[PDB]
């Protein structure tokens, strides 16, 4: 198995789908399989979109490189680097530990997390682990984006708004979500804990209400990752920032976003006056959601077994505005999911 | 003290110097001072360029907000967040540890580092801690950028090329440096250890020899941070990579690079075919260099005492190419340092 075979597998997928599939996607796919036979683990190790993985794995099996039977088994030696093992086990490779947050936020958060609303398919939900939420807020603490600040959270199954308000740092936290269950849980917690936290039912496909335009110092979001979803979550966030010196925090996966789309998103940030100051890949680990067998890619999977441990992860990005972002505050029409999206 | 005051201080410096100093850099300056009275620690905690810190501190002192004596003490209550304290102590906030590197690389590297060339002012040198070098290489291991790859290191006081070769993963490592001491040390270690590591004296202001153009899969550099220096080091890096799927690792400070410059660099990268896949801020810690009293900023400092612990830090950026970068291979003419540079 030589280099050209990786190139040819990628070109085949490219020809069949119109998607930006490269030879290095194939390399990554093979690399992961040097370390595991389990499909979900292969996804986690690969750093390739699940939309790409399926036809790549098919192409590799058509060439006799891969056996697809109860597992994914490499049948040949391959020109692909094996996954490294250098993640710091103390912080799960984050660099940040949420346990250190003020106000005993970590212990108080874990109590509330035990009663959180289940992730539902109606809103593409799937929350990160409590440690992930707390570390996300710890990053914001470290960069000075919580204390005395006005914080907006756009979608909050992760309960970032709650963790942030439990630290005792923000001036106030406002959460928007389409799901009344999330809104109500946050309002309940806000009342019981005496927090300056408010939550509102709002669908981000509609314009942002004028009270929230250029009114915040800091936003958090873990958005739907089609370009329209990026616009509706991250563009609203940028519109919500007062301007220069304000910060945003964004969750971004490989599972549903190609490196080509990573670049497009980075261009979108730079052209709207932002700059990236942190990008910690694999920072968030997601809890398995109940609706996995009803998601888009399920029927395509070569092995179909419910996952028993976490597999879906995302990066944390920190951005800062160098000037006010003057984005159109229009309705977003059309699908927030794109062709790369597979777990909705 | 109100937010308007922070804006005023910033505008004064901006007007006096022509540099892009904003209110948030003042806020960051003040926040650091809430946490420490030590100048070097204030620089570390600020995430602001030293070029900006000097005139911000002086402006704060003229306003009766800062006392400068044997330390730096705030004289009023200020609207600035304290930097948080959530970095993982096990990995020094990096999320990666060099210890599990293959080949006994960590232990072997530490032996060699005991005999390394000391940093000299003639080449603006200052090496990272041995664990920083090893962590950098471990990030590359984790991303599949070592095993069987062709590795170029552009500037190597950090000895990244030696650490990478010690893993036994690369197919070969080539190092370029203008300092013959660095080159000779690497040649010496390569022969002693029998590694596929070579080094060459090369001034990166001159064109890259053809043999190294589009020849490599991975590059590492920790560059001079004026725009010309970024062209001489990172641009040559980009030109050295074969193309799509090849990676680069770049060190980038706040101490000598403003966020306006960070954005211009990120633009430069996206426009020439790259995408950022990691940006771990504060990843590298630098050892203190012997010529600190002879560096540009020393006479300006409001308090002058030699540092006793590390203070100068940089981010580690991983980029990947989405396509070949066809940059010009011309002479770089002019100063690699710019007005934001202060440690040369
Ligand atoms: C995308 S999943 C993250 C969060 O976004 C919320 N969400 C999903 N779609 C939308 C939408 N169109 N507008 C607002 N919130 C949404 C979810 O209910 C969840 O809490
Ligand atoms: C900038 S310090 C990092 C490394 O770059 C090297 N260096 C500095 N200037 C040049 C240059 N013009 N060409 C090549 N290497 C350089 C130094 O010797 C050091 O090892
Ligand atoms: N469909 C379930 C898995 C996708 C979850 N997405 C929303 C997560 C919200 N916490 C991932 C978003 C990645 N940006
Ligand atoms: N001049 C004192 C220290 C300079 C550090 N610069 C060179 C470091 C090389 N290991 C910083 C480079 C930052 N990109
Ligand atoms: Fe750690």
mmCIF file of N, CA and C in Angstrom, chain A residues 3 14 21-24 27-28 34 47 80-97 100-101 138 141-145 147 149 242 244-247 254 259-260 262-263 266-267 270 274-282 318 320 322, chain B residues 3 14 21-24 27-28 34 47 80-91 93-97 100 138-139 141-145 147 149 217 242 244-247 254 259-260 262-263 266-267 270-271 274-281 318 320 322:
data_model
loop_
_atom_site.group_PDB
_atom_site.id
_atom_site.type_symbol
_atom_site.label_atom_id
_atom_site.label_comp_id
_atom_site.label_asym_id
_atom_site.label_seq_id
_atom_site.Cartn_x
_atom_site.Cartn_y
_atom_site.Cartn_z
ATOM 1 N N UNK A 3 1.526 5.586 -1.228
ATOM 2 C CA UNK A 3 0.941 6.912 -1.207
ATOM 3 C C UNK A 3 -0.135 7.170 -2.272
ATOM 4 N N UNK A 14 -14.170 12.111 -3.672
ATOM 5 C CA UNK A 14 -14.399 13.440 -4.182
ATOM 6 C C UNK A 14 -15.316 13.411 -5.435
ATOM 7 N N UNK A 21 -12.586 16.141 0.051
ATOM 8 C CA UNK A 21 -11.929 15.016 0.618
ATOM 9 C C UNK A 21 -10.515 14.890 0.030
ATOM 10 N N UNK A 22 -9.522 14.895 0.913
ATOM 11 C CA UNK A 22 -8.086 14.843 0.509
ATOM 12 C C UNK A 22 -7.389 13.576 0.868
ATOM 13 N N UNK A 23 -6.162 13.375 0.352
ATOM 14 C CA UNK A 23 -5.403 12.223 0.661
ATOM 15 C C UNK A 23 -5.115 12.145 2.167
ATOM 16 N N UNK A 24 -4.927 13.303 2.826
ATOM 17 C CA UNK A 24 -4.561 13.257 4.255
ATOM 18 C C UNK A 24 -5.776 12.812 5.097
ATOM 19 N N UNK A 27 -5.307 9.255 5.070
ATOM 20 C CA UNK A 27 -4.196 8.848 5.869
ATOM 21 C C UNK A 27 -4.644 8.772 7.316
ATOM 22 N N UNK A 28 -5.392 9.767 7.713
ATOM 23 C CA UNK A 28 -5.865 9.863 9.094
ATOM 24 C C UNK A 28 -6.798 8.695 9.399
ATOM 25 N N UNK A 34 -4.966 1.745 12.906
ATOM 26 C CA UNK A 34 -3.810 1.039 13.406
ATOM 27 C C UNK A 34 -3.955 0.886 14.890
ATOM 28 N N UNK A 47 -9.935 12.421 13.473
ATOM 29 C CA UNK A 47 -10.092 13.797 13.142
ATOM 30 C C UNK A 47 -10.591 14.041 11.741
ATOM 31 N N UNK A 80 0.689 5.236 7.195
ATOM 32 C CA UNK A 80 -0.129 6.166 8.007
ATOM 33 C C UNK A 80 0.357 6.192 9.404
ATOM 34 N N UNK A 81 0.583 7.393 9.946
ATOM 35 C CA UNK A 81 1.073 7.462 11.309
ATOM 36 C C UNK A 81 0.048 6.974 12.317
ATOM 37 N N UNK A 82 0.482 6.255 13.298
ATOM 38 C CA UNK A 82 -0.377 5.783 14.374
ATOM 39 C C UNK A 82 -0.651 6.973 15.330
ATOM 40 N N UNK A 83 -1.825 6.997 15.985
ATOM 41 C CA UNK A 83 -2.144 8.043 16.960
ATOM 42 C C UNK A 83 -1.131 8.169 18.060
ATOM 43 N N UNK A 84 -0.751 9.386 18.396
ATOM 44 C CA UNK A 84 0.191 9.594 19.497
ATOM 45 C C UNK A 84 -0.520 9.492 20.826
ATOM 46 N N UNK A 85 0.226 9.433 21.900
ATOM 47 C CA UNK A 85 -0.332 9.255 23.208
ATOM 48 C C UNK A 85 0.170 10.302 24.186
ATOM 49 N N UNK A 86 0.305 11.535 23.754
ATOM 50 C CA UNK A 86 0.920 12.515 24.620
ATOM 51 C C UNK A 86 -0.048 13.418 25.418
ATOM 52 N N UNK A 87 -1.349 13.264 25.242
ATOM 53 C CA UNK A 87 -2.360 14.007 26.056
ATOM 54 C C UNK A 87 -2.043 13.950 27.547
ATOM 55 N N UNK A 88 -2.117 15.069 28.251
ATOM 56 C CA UNK A 88 -1.900 15.041 29.723
ATOM 57 C C UNK A 88 -3.090 14.376 30.384
ATOM 58 N N UNK A 89 -2.858 13.248 31.079
ATOM 59 C CA UNK A 89 -4.037 12.549 31.622
ATOM 60 C C UNK A 89 -4.740 13.321 32.746
ATOM 61 N N UNK A 90 -4.038 14.224 33.445
ATOM 62 C CA UNK A 90 -4.681 14.964 34.550
ATOM 63 C C UNK A 90 -5.820 15.905 34.100
ATOM 64 N N UNK A 91 -5.700 16.511 32.917
ATOM 65 C CA UNK A 91 -6.691 17.466 32.447
ATOM 66 C C UNK A 91 -7.341 16.976 31.141
ATOM 67 N N UNK A 92 -7.199 15.681 30.829
ATOM 68 C CA UNK A 92 -7.678 15.081 29.571
ATOM 69 C C UNK A 92 -7.254 15.855 28.312
ATOM 70 N N UNK A 93 -6.035 16.356 28.372
ATOM 71 C CA UNK A 93 -5.479 17.112 27.265
ATOM 72 C C UNK A 93 -5.944 18.521 27.066
ATOM 73 N N UNK A 94 -6.732 19.054 28.010
ATOM 74 C CA UNK A 94 -7.246 20.427 27.909
ATOM 75 C C UNK A 94 -6.238 21.520 28.246
ATOM 76 N N UNK A 95 -5.433 21.268 29.262
ATOM 77 C CA UNK A 95 -4.570 22.270 29.841
ATOM 78 C C UNK A 95 -5.222 23.058 30.952
ATOM 79 N N UNK A 96 -6.537 22.893 31.132
ATOM 80 C CA UNK A 96 -7.335 23.713 32.052
ATOM 81 C C UNK A 96 -8.121 22.732 32.900
ATOM 82 N N UNK A 97 -8.285 23.052 34.189
ATOM 83 C CA UNK A 97 -9.034 22.190 35.121
ATOM 84 C C UNK A 97 -10.187 23.038 35.761
ATOM 85 N N UNK A 100 -10.743 24.290 39.746
ATOM 86 C CA UNK A 100 -10.155 25.441 40.334
ATOM 87 C C UNK A 100 -11.063 26.691 40.299
ATOM 88 N N UNK A 101 -12.214 26.618 39.644
ATOM 89 C CA UNK A 101 -13.124 27.782 39.579
ATOM 90 C C UNK A 101 -13.586 28.329 40.931
ATOM 91 N N UNK A 138 -13.643 27.907 32.726
ATOM 92 C CA UNK A 138 -12.267 28.156 33.262
ATOM 93 C C UNK A 138 -11.375 28.900 32.241
ATOM 94 N N UNK A 141 -12.482 32.378 32.413
ATOM 95 C CA UNK A 141 -11.991 32.976 33.673
ATOM 96 C C UNK A 141 -10.516 33.422 33.473
ATOM 97 N N UNK A 142 -9.723 32.536 32.904
ATOM 98 C CA UNK A 142 -8.262 32.771 32.741
ATOM 99 C C UNK A 142 -8.011 33.965 31.822
ATOM 100 N N UNK A 143 -8.883 34.158 30.822
ATOM 101 C CA UNK A 143 -8.710 35.277 29.901
ATOM 102 C C UNK A 143 -9.430 36.534 30.366
ATOM 103 N N UNK A 144 -9.948 36.565 31.605
ATOM 104 C CA UNK A 144 -10.564 37.795 32.051
ATOM 105 C C UNK A 144 -11.892 38.171 31.404
ATOM 106 N N UNK A 145 -12.606 37.185 30.856
ATOM 107 C CA UNK A 145 -13.862 37.415 30.168
ATOM 108 C C UNK A 145 -15.108 37.109 30.959
ATOM 109 N N UNK A 147 -15.305 38.168 34.869
ATOM 110 C CA UNK A 147 -15.471 39.078 36.024
ATOM 111 C C UNK A 147 -15.950 40.475 35.668
ATOM 112 N N UNK A 149 -18.392 41.222 33.810
ATOM 113 C CA UNK A 149 -18.793 41.288 32.395
ATOM 114 C C UNK A 149 -20.271 40.837 32.175
ATOM 115 N N UNK A 242 -20.387 44.166 22.151
ATOM 116 C CA UNK A 242 -20.279 45.639 22.047
ATOM 117 C C UNK A 242 -19.297 46.094 20.995
ATOM 118 N N UNK A 244 -14.791 46.291 19.977
ATOM 119 C CA UNK A 244 -13.375 46.017 20.243
ATOM 120 C C UNK A 244 -13.149 45.546 21.692
ATOM 121 N N UNK A 245 -12.342 44.502 21.826
ATOM 122 C CA UNK A 245 -11.978 43.965 23.113
ATOM 123 C C UNK A 245 -12.917 42.943 23.700
ATOM 124 N N UNK A 246 -14.023 42.686 23.036
ATOM 125 C CA UNK A 246 -15.005 41.710 23.492
ATOM 126 C C UNK A 246 -14.647 40.332 22.972
ATOM 127 N N UNK A 247 -15.145 39.262 23.613
ATOM 128 C CA UNK A 247 -14.645 37.923 23.322
ATOM 129 C C UNK A 247 -15.762 36.951 23.026
ATOM 130 N N UNK A 254 -14.431 18.288 14.343
ATOM 131 C CA UNK A 254 -14.033 17.659 13.050
ATOM 132 C C UNK A 254 -15.126 16.732 12.558
ATOM 133 N N UNK A 259 -11.706 20.413 7.234
ATOM 134 C CA UNK A 259 -10.715 21.487 7.346
ATOM 135 C C UNK A 259 -10.939 22.570 6.370
ATOM 136 N N UNK A 260 -11.451 22.228 5.184
ATOM 137 C CA UNK A 260 -11.929 23.269 4.326
ATOM 138 C C UNK A 260 -12.966 24.221 4.940
ATOM 139 N N UNK A 262 -13.300 24.639 8.191
ATOM 140 C CA UNK A 262 -12.529 25.319 9.282
ATOM 141 C C UNK A 262 -11.889 26.611 8.742
ATOM 142 N N UNK A 263 -11.327 26.489 7.540
ATOM 143 C CA UNK A 263 -10.684 27.650 6.925
ATOM 144 C C UNK A 263 -11.714 28.730 6.564
ATOM 145 N N UNK A 266 -12.697 30.518 9.674
ATOM 146 C CA UNK A 266 -11.624 31.394 10.081
ATOM 147 C C UNK A 266 -11.595 32.637 9.225
ATOM 148 N N UNK A 267 -11.830 32.485 7.938
ATOM 149 C CA UNK A 267 -11.948 33.700 7.078
ATOM 150 C C UNK A 267 -13.168 34.621 7.465
ATOM 151 N N UNK A 270 -12.111 36.534 10.544
ATOM 152 C CA UNK A 270 -11.130 37.607 10.264
ATOM 153 C C UNK A 270 -11.773 38.786 9.496
ATOM 154 N N UNK A 274 -12.531 39.911 13.919
ATOM 155 C CA UNK A 274 -12.117 39.092 15.039
ATOM 156 C C UNK A 274 -10.713 38.544 14.779
ATOM 157 N N UNK A 275 -10.097 37.996 15.810
ATOM 158 C CA UNK A 275 -8.863 37.309 15.743
ATOM 159 C C UNK A 275 -8.933 36.097 16.698
ATOM 160 N N UNK A 276 -8.319 34.972 16.344
ATOM 161 C CA UNK A 276 -8.326 33.770 17.172
ATOM 162 C C UNK A 276 -7.173 33.869 18.137
ATOM 163 N N UNK A 277 -7.437 33.665 19.423
ATOM 164 C CA UNK A 277 -6.396 33.709 20.434
ATOM 165 C C UNK A 277 -6.252 32.406 21.157
ATOM 166 N N UNK A 278 -7.169 31.473 20.978
ATOM 167 C CA UNK A 278 -6.997 30.097 21.461
ATOM 168 C C UNK A 278 -7.736 29.178 20.529
ATOM 169 N N UNK A 279 -7.193 28.000 20.294
ATOM 170 C CA UNK A 279 -7.889 26.940 19.520
ATOM 171 C C UNK A 279 -7.368 25.658 20.110
ATOM 172 N N UNK A 280 -8.102 25.087 21.057
ATOM 173 C CA UNK A 280 -7.689 23.883 21.718
ATOM 174 C C UNK A 280 -8.456 22.703 21.208
ATOM 175 N N UNK A 281 -7.852 21.923 20.323
ATOM 176 C CA UNK A 281 -8.574 20.860 19.649
ATOM 177 C C UNK A 281 -8.829 19.685 20.581
ATOM 178 N N UNK A 282 -10.011 19.105 20.476
ATOM 179 C CA UNK A 282 -10.363 17.989 21.353
ATOM 180 C C UNK A 282 -10.616 18.347 22.800
ATOM 181 N N UNK A 318 -11.298 30.562 21.188
ATOM 182 C CA UNK A 318 -11.482 31.906 21.723
ATOM 183 C C UNK A 318 -11.141 32.912 20.668
ATOM 184 N N UNK A 320 -11.415 37.269 19.748
ATOM 185 C CA UNK A 320 -11.521 38.601 20.304
ATOM 186 C C UNK A 320 -11.723 39.560 19.157
ATOM 187 N N UNK A 322 -11.312 43.012 17.247
ATOM 188 C CA UNK A 322 -10.426 44.172 17.101
ATOM 189 C C UNK A 322 -11.182 45.429 16.739
ATOM 190 N N UNK B 3 -14.432 52.829 32.844
ATOM 191 C CA UNK B 3 -13.983 52.348 31.538
ATOM 192 C C UNK B 3 -13.473 53.477 30.633
ATOM 193 N N UNK B 14 -1.688 55.361 21.795
ATOM 194 C CA UNK B 14 -1.899 55.195 20.373
ATOM 195 C C UNK B 14 -1.456 56.431 19.591
ATOM 196 N N UNK B 21 -2.755 50.314 20.078
ATOM 197 C CA UNK B 21 -3.041 50.085 21.509
ATOM 198 C C UNK B 21 -4.510 50.430 21.782
ATOM 199 N N UNK B 22 -5.242 49.485 22.343
ATOM 200 C CA UNK B 22 -6.654 49.617 22.641
ATOM 201 C C UNK B 22 -6.934 49.498 24.119
ATOM 202 N N UNK B 23 -8.171 49.834 24.465
ATOM 203 C CA UNK B 23 -8.619 49.873 25.839
ATOM 204 C C UNK B 23 -8.439 48.533 26.486
ATOM 205 N N UNK B 24 -8.553 47.443 25.705
ATOM 206 C CA UNK B 24 -8.496 46.126 26.372
ATOM 207 C C UNK B 24 -7.073 45.805 26.836
ATOM 208 N N UNK B 27 -6.856 47.324 30.117
ATOM 209 C CA UNK B 27 -7.594 46.553 31.083
ATOM 210 C C UNK B 27 -6.757 45.362 31.503
ATOM 211 N N UNK B 28 -6.191 44.695 30.528
ATOM 212 C CA UNK B 28 -5.304 43.571 30.784
ATOM 213 C C UNK B 28 -4.077 43.959 31.640
ATOM 214 N N UNK B 34 -3.498 43.750 39.577
ATOM 215 C CA UNK B 34 -4.273 43.262 40.719
ATOM 216 C C UNK B 34 -3.693 41.988 41.325
ATOM 217 N N UNK B 47 -0.598 39.360 28.994
ATOM 218 C CA UNK B 47 -0.837 39.079 27.546
ATOM 219 C C UNK B 47 -0.845 40.347 26.674
ATOM 220 N N UNK B 80 -11.032 46.011 36.266
ATOM 221 C CA UNK B 80 -10.266 45.102 35.454
ATOM 222 C C UNK B 80 -10.318 43.716 36.049
ATOM 223 N N UNK B 81 -10.571 42.696 35.228
ATOM 224 C CA UNK B 81 -10.607 41.375 35.810
ATOM 225 C C UNK B 81 -9.229 40.843 36.275
ATOM 226 N N UNK B 82 -9.152 40.181 37.435
ATOM 227 C CA UNK B 82 -7.969 39.376 37.741
ATOM 228 C C UNK B 82 -7.870 38.207 36.793
ATOM 229 N N UNK B 83 -6.680 37.948 36.268
ATOM 230 C CA UNK B 83 -6.480 36.739 35.503
ATOM 231 C C UNK B 83 -6.786 35.493 36.372
ATOM 232 N N UNK B 84 -7.498 34.570 35.786
ATOM 233 C CA UNK B 84 -7.857 33.359 36.512
ATOM 234 C C UNK B 84 -6.700 32.390 36.708
ATOM 235 N N UNK B 85 -6.951 31.315 37.478
ATOM 236 C CA UNK B 85 -5.910 30.430 37.974
ATOM 237 C C UNK B 85 -6.265 28.992 37.694
ATOM 238 N N UNK B 86 -6.796 28.742 36.499
ATOM 239 C CA UNK B 86 -7.235 27.389 36.201
ATOM 240 C C UNK B 86 -6.308 26.548 35.366
ATOM 241 N N UNK B 87 -5.120 27.044 34.985
ATOM 242 C CA UNK B 87 -4.108 26.138 34.303
ATOM 243 C C UNK B 87 -3.819 24.844 35.059
ATOM 244 N N UNK B 88 -3.780 23.706 34.335
ATOM 245 C CA UNK B 88 -3.456 22.411 34.933
ATOM 246 C C UNK B 88 -1.977 22.436 35.360
ATOM 247 N N UNK B 89 -1.692 22.097 36.633
ATOM 248 C CA UNK B 89 -0.300 22.201 37.118
ATOM 249 C C UNK B 89 0.587 21.084 36.580
ATOM 250 N N UNK B 90 0.002 19.925 36.273
ATOM 251 C CA UNK B 90 0.708 18.759 35.759
ATOM 252 C C UNK B 90 1.398 19.003 34.393
ATOM 253 N N UNK B 91 0.764 19.767 33.498
ATOM 254 C CA UNK B 91 1.303 20.016 32.165
ATOM 255 C C UNK B 91 1.602 21.467 31.973
ATOM 256 N N UNK B 93 -0.325 23.841 31.963
ATOM 257 C CA UNK B 93 -1.372 24.406 31.118
ATOM 258 C C UNK B 93 -1.330 24.005 29.647
ATOM 259 N N UNK B 94 -0.387 23.153 29.265
ATOM 260 C CA UNK B 94 -0.221 22.815 27.820
ATOM 261 C C UNK B 94 -1.225 21.763 27.335
ATOM 262 N N UNK B 95 -1.654 20.862 28.238
ATOM 263 C CA UNK B 95 -2.457 19.685 27.842
ATOM 264 C C UNK B 95 -1.680 18.514 27.219
ATOM 265 N N UNK B 96 -0.384 18.714 27.012
ATOM 266 C CA UNK B 96 0.535 17.721 26.421
ATOM 267 C C UNK B 96 1.783 17.601 27.289
ATOM 268 N N UNK B 97 2.282 16.376 27.338
ATOM 269 C CA UNK B 97 3.474 16.040 28.150
ATOM 270 C C UNK B 97 4.464 15.282 27.250
ATOM 271 N N UNK B 100 6.037 10.452 27.308
ATOM 272 C CA UNK B 100 5.741 9.181 26.620
ATOM 273 C C UNK B 100 6.256 9.153 25.227
ATOM 274 N N UNK B 138 5.782 16.534 20.976
ATOM 275 C CA UNK B 138 4.668 15.633 21.318
ATOM 276 C C UNK B 138 3.340 16.051 20.710
ATOM 277 N N UNK B 139 3.128 17.342 20.490
ATOM 278 C CA UNK B 139 1.933 17.832 19.759
ATOM 279 C C UNK B 139 1.987 17.299 18.300
ATOM 280 N N UNK B 141 3.664 14.586 17.277
ATOM 281 C CA UNK B 141 3.464 13.156 17.384
ATOM 282 C C UNK B 141 1.976 12.845 17.362
ATOM 283 N N UNK B 142 1.261 13.528 18.227
ATOM 284 C CA UNK B 142 -0.202 13.353 18.323
ATOM 285 C C UNK B 142 -0.986 13.644 17.100
ATOM 286 N N UNK B 143 -0.519 14.573 16.282
ATOM 287 C CA UNK B 143 -1.165 14.936 15.054
ATOM 288 C C UNK B 143 -0.669 14.158 13.822
ATOM 289 N N UNK B 144 0.129 13.115 14.055
ATOM 290 C CA UNK B 144 0.698 12.323 12.933
ATOM 291 C C UNK B 144 1.700 13.011 12.040
ATOM 292 N N UNK B 145 2.394 14.008 12.583
ATOM 293 C CA UNK B 145 3.283 14.810 11.759
ATOM 294 C C UNK B 145 4.725 14.408 11.866
ATOM 295 N N UNK B 147 5.825 10.570 12.155
ATOM 296 C CA UNK B 147 6.130 9.216 11.747
ATOM 297 C C UNK B 147 6.246 9.065 10.242
ATOM 298 N N UNK B 149 7.727 11.038 8.259
ATOM 299 C CA UNK B 149 7.689 12.272 7.530
ATOM 300 C C UNK B 149 9.084 12.911 7.410
ATOM 301 N N UNK B 217 7.197 17.488 4.688
ATOM 302 C CA UNK B 217 5.830 17.255 5.176
ATOM 303 C C UNK B 217 5.476 18.089 6.417
ATOM 304 N N UNK B 242 5.562 20.322 0.897
ATOM 305 C CA UNK B 242 5.133 19.773 -0.454
ATOM 306 C C UNK B 242 3.819 20.309 -0.942
ATOM 307 N N UNK B 244 -0.677 20.181 -0.101
ATOM 308 C CA UNK B 244 -1.854 19.766 0.654
ATOM 309 C C UNK B 244 -1.564 18.663 1.659
ATOM 310 N N UNK B 245 -2.011 18.882 2.901
ATOM 311 C CA UNK B 245 -1.846 17.857 3.925
ATOM 312 C C UNK B 245 -0.560 17.972 4.765
ATOM 313 N N UNK B 246 0.334 18.888 4.414
ATOM 314 C CA UNK B 246 1.578 19.119 5.139
ATOM 315 C C UNK B 246 1.309 20.156 6.229
ATOM 316 N N UNK B 247 2.078 20.080 7.322
ATOM 317 C CA UNK B 247 1.839 20.862 8.514
ATOM 318 C C UNK B 247 2.963 21.753 8.924
ATOM 319 N N UNK B 254 2.686 37.104 22.760
ATOM 320 C CA UNK B 254 2.103 38.383 22.987
ATOM 321 C C UNK B 254 3.178 39.430 23.321
ATOM 322 N N UNK B 259 -2.343 41.943 19.138
ATOM 323 C CA UNK B 259 -3.443 41.226 18.491
ATOM 324 C C UNK B 259 -3.715 41.701 17.067
ATOM 325 N N UNK B 260 -3.433 42.971 16.741
ATOM 326 C CA UNK B 260 -3.573 43.431 15.343
ATOM 327 C C UNK B 260 -2.626 42.650 14.432
ATOM 328 N N UNK B 262 -1.338 39.624 15.266
ATOM 329 C CA UNK B 262 -1.860 38.257 15.223
ATOM 330 C C UNK B 262 -2.884 38.093 14.070
ATOM 331 N N UNK B 263 -3.792 39.048 13.935
ATOM 332 C CA UNK B 263 -4.799 38.947 12.885
ATOM 333 C C UNK B 263 -4.179 39.047 11.483
ATOM 334 N N UNK B 266 -2.687 35.710 10.748
ATOM 335 C CA UNK B 266 -3.698 34.724 10.511
ATOM 336 C C UNK B 266 -4.263 34.930 9.085
ATOM 337 N N UNK B 267 -4.415 36.173 8.692
ATOM 338 C CA UNK B 267 -4.757 36.443 7.307
ATOM 339 C C UNK B 267 -3.817 35.955 6.216
ATOM 340 N N UNK B 270 -4.218 32.234 6.018
ATOM 341 C CA UNK B 270 -5.397 31.737 5.314
ATOM 342 C C UNK B 270 -5.273 32.065 3.820
ATOM 343 N N UNK B 271 -4.732 33.241 3.499
ATOM 344 C CA UNK B 271 -4.637 33.616 2.082
ATOM 345 C C UNK B 271 -3.653 32.776 1.285
ATOM 346 N N UNK B 274 -3.313 27.929 4.118
ATOM 347 C CA UNK B 274 -3.262 27.174 5.391
ATOM 348 C C UNK B 274 -4.561 27.346 6.199
ATOM 349 N N UNK B 275 -4.743 26.475 7.182
ATOM 350 C CA UNK B 275 -5.827 26.571 8.132
ATOM 351 C C UNK B 275 -5.189 26.310 9.524
ATOM 352 N N UNK B 276 -5.639 26.992 10.546
ATOM 353 C CA UNK B 276 -5.093 26.788 11.877
ATOM 354 C C UNK B 276 -5.888 25.647 12.502
ATOM 355 N N UNK B 277 -5.206 24.649 13.045
ATOM 356 C CA UNK B 277 -5.870 23.547 13.699
ATOM 357 C C UNK B 277 -5.575 23.469 15.161
ATOM 358 N N UNK B 278 -4.576 24.178 15.653
ATOM 359 C CA UNK B 278 -4.315 24.319 17.118
ATOM 360 C C UNK B 278 -3.778 25.658 17.361
ATOM 361 N N UNK B 279 -4.166 26.322 18.462
ATOM 362 C CA UNK B 279 -3.475 27.521 18.865
ATOM 363 C C UNK B 279 -3.531 27.422 20.411
ATOM 364 N N UNK B 280 -2.444 26.947 21.009
ATOM 365 C CA UNK B 280 -2.404 26.772 22.460
ATOM 366 C C UNK B 280 -1.602 27.909 23.077
ATOM 367 N N UNK B 281 -2.290 28.879 23.633
ATOM 368 C CA UNK B 281 -1.615 30.071 24.084
ATOM 369 C C UNK B 281 -0.871 29.780 25.363
ATOM 370 N N UNK B 318 -0.499 25.177 15.282
ATOM 371 C CA UNK B 318 -0.349 24.148 14.262
ATOM 372 C C UNK B 318 -1.233 24.580 13.123
ATOM 373 N N UNK B 320 -2.172 23.582 8.863
ATOM 374 C CA UNK B 320 -2.085 22.513 7.845
ATOM 375 C C UNK B 320 -2.403 23.203 6.545
ATOM 376 N N UNK B 322 -4.166 23.308 2.958
ATOM 377 C CA UNK B 322 -5.263 22.801 2.131
ATOM 378 C C UNK B 322 -4.836 22.716 0.679
#
